[PDB]
């Protein structure tokens, strides 16, 4: 068990390549901690383990209004995608910066659910975008990596200020 | 398209002269814009960087490079909230280092037809204006760095 902190850029732990999970029983506590941490944010809808400094390939998502529809993805991978479009994204690890990012709008993701059983999600919903964002975190990528150098400097400046001025 | 000078070049250290006749510098403004838009990566350009002593700056922070900002006789009249931020410079190519700037500024200037302009900003534009305006008094951002860092800068420029 752990108290998890959401890390913010620039922090090299956000750039680590995640490790595949080979012992699903061993990550149940982390999954519940990740869910609690996501549910403690005002606005977050997903969270990836590298964002709390853990190297396991684990993502949690909850798109629901009441936050009672948790989705847990272990070892997720995009196995098909098509129909790229631009859409605004923000990130708990790049707080207070938002920009349009290109993603597939139809995707199939394969993973294990939290009990270790095979999971295959086929979606053209906003969930497709959210899964791609979270899966990017597992390869140490942030959405600002797709932007121009000027926009990346703009983002880092905004993050630094938001983090410095955050209230307790 | 004009040529951008690199340090060490005493023309980068010239104190710029105020512009009193806006019509006579209209050709230079378009020349500065063409020269900036011919760079791979630049977002602003000051007249001393093309060997001219007139107090003129051009800036474009847009993705498509279709929102030029032209500043004649620009002056920082207020600033607050100094912070460190990375800068690079077309006149110190391939050198990047953290430098202190105001993150909230008020700049007074004239637009390209001479009417008064007052820009109050806490955005990234604040940094770019300060960097460009520094060029007009013959300052490069490396002047604010330690001697060891300045020594390094000169080596990097030469290799470019
Ligand atoms: C949009 C694609 C990614 C969503 C996941 C992120 C959280 C995150 O960084 N996951 O790695 C999020 O909730 N981002 C929020 C976000 O961008 N949201 C919240 C839902 C709508 C959208 C507004 O841009 C911000 C406010 C932190
Ligand atoms: C950053 C504040 C001032 C920037 C202005 C300079 C140009 C300059 O030398 N003006 O006198 C620029 O475009 N610099 C570029 C720069 O540092 N950039 C380009 C946009 C983002 C940032 C780092 O990538 C380099 C690559 C030449
Ligand atoms: Ni994110
Ligand atoms: Ni410069």
Residue numbers in the entry:
A (entry chain G): 13 to 180
B (entry chain D): 15 to 174
Paper excerpt:
Peptide deformylases (PDFs) are metalloproteases that catalyze the removal of the formyl group from the initiator methionine, a critical step in the N-terminal methionine excision (NME) process. Most PDFs share a common catalytic core defined by three conserved sequence motifs (I, II, and III), which coordinate a metal ion and position key residues for substrate processing.
However, Def2VCH shows a specific pattern variation in the amino acids, described in E. coli, as responsible for ribosome binding. We found that Def2VCH specifically confers reduced susceptibility to the natural PDF inhibitor, ACT. To explore this possibility at the molecular level, we determined high-resolution crystal structures of both proteins in complex with ACT. In both structures, ACT binds in the same location within the catalytic pocket and adopts a nearly identical orientation and conformation, blocking access to the active site located at the bottom of a deep cavity in the protein core. In contrast, Def2VCH exhibited a different binding pattern. This is mainly due to the substitution of arginine 97 with a tyrosine, which weakens the interaction with ACT by abolishing important hydrogen bonds between the NH1 and NH2 atoms of Arg97 and solvent-exposed oxygen atoms of ACT (namely O20 and O27). These substitutions likely contribute to the variation in ACT binding affinity between Def1VCH and Def2VCH, explaining their different capacities to confer resistance to this inhibitor.
